[PDB]
Amino acid sequence: GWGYGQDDGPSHWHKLYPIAQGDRQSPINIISSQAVYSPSLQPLELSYEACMSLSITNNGHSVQVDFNDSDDRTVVTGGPLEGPYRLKQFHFHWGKKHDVGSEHTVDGKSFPSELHLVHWNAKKYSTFGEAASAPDGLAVVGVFLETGDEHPSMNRLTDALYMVRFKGTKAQFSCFNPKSLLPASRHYWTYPGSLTTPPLSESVTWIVLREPISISERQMGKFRSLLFTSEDDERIHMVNNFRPPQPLKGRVVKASFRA
Numbered sequence: 001g002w003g004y005g006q007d008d009g010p011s012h013w014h015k016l017y018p019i020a021q022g023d024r025q026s027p028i029n030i031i032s033s034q035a036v037y038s039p040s041l042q043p044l045e046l047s048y049e050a051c052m053s054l055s056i057t058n059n060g061h062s063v064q065v066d067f068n069d070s071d072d073r074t075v076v077t078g079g080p081l082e083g084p085y086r087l088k089q090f091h092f093h094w095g096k097k098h099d100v101g102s103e104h105t106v107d108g109k110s111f112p113s114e115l116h117l118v119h120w121n122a123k124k125y126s127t128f129g130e131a132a133s134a135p136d137g138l139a140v141v142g143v144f145l146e147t148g149d150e151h152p153s154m155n156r157l158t159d160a161l162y163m164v165r166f167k168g169t170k171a172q173f174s175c176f177n178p179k180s181l182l183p184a185s186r187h188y189w190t191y192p193g194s195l196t197t198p199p200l201s202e203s204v205t206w207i208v209l210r211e212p213i214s215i216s217e218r219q220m221g222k223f224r225s226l227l228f229t230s231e232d233d234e235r236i237h238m239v240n241n242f243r244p245p246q247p248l249k250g251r252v253v254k255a256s257f258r259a
């Protein structure tokens with residue numbers, strides 16, 4: 001019912017999910033000079049185990065790696081979070097050129113891709129779905145990707161894309177440590193927001209890392225080789241699967257650092 005094409009793209013989502021015009025929608029354009037330095041925030045800690053990954057899937061909207069979230073082994077804690085949130089899955093948003101692809105932008109600048117590590121408040125809610133509807137239910141850590149030098153650990157992931165090039169396909173993806181996709185800095189911007197895809201619920205505490213990671217153009221190209229379409233269909237490459245910046249509506253963006 002929704003996608004990233006000319007007829008079902010982000011500009012039309014509100015026709016189906018009215019909350020798309022809400023007061024805490026994501027993503028947003030981060031004006032670094034207007035972010036509020038908040039030294040009162042606790043250190044952001046991403047405590048990830050190496051073998052919690054389950055599979056890699058092309059769900060028609062992105063490529064997603066799902067995790068075992070039975071306990072609090074792989075969690076994010078600190079920063080603006082009151083407690084630990086368990087990692088459920090990570091996925092990406094990307095474009096067709098280096099000038100576009102990320103959802104969040106910084107001072108008007110977009111990156112070729114953005115990684116989203118999705119976590120939920122399992123201590124408070126029974127299911128991820130239950131959490132995805134509550135204001136304090138989710139915590140998504142966003143990491144910008146820039147193109148430059150090849151990323152060693154990313155190779156395992158980009159090499160796996162061929163087997164999930166078609167929509168609705170999946171493959172086993174064991175022992176991939178999402179910590180390998182994090183930058184050396186834990187500085188970030190945070191603000192109250194929403195899921196960036198339908199149902200667009202305003203249940204996400206966003207934590208956007210300041211430092212991007214880089215992958216090579218070859219690796220980025222592997223993402224663009226994915227398809228929005230199934231095997232027996234006219235091929236349409238999965239690109240520009242991002243939602244543009246939404247109105248801030250008076251929300252305060254906090255920063256764990258001084259610009």
Ligand SMILES: NS(=O)(=O)c1ccc(C(=O)N2CCN(Cc3ccc(F)cc3)CC2)cc1
Nearest residue numbers: 089116118132140194195196197198199204
């Ligand atoms: N990019 S993001 O904001 O980081 C993000 C994070 C989590 C999710 C996520 O797992 N699904 C949300 C969507 N739902 C499907 C859905 C769609 C429409 C509905 F009305 C209900 C449920 C599956 C779970 C999606 C996007």
Ligand SMILES: [Zn+2]
Nearest residue numbers: 091093116196
């Ligand atoms: Zn996302």
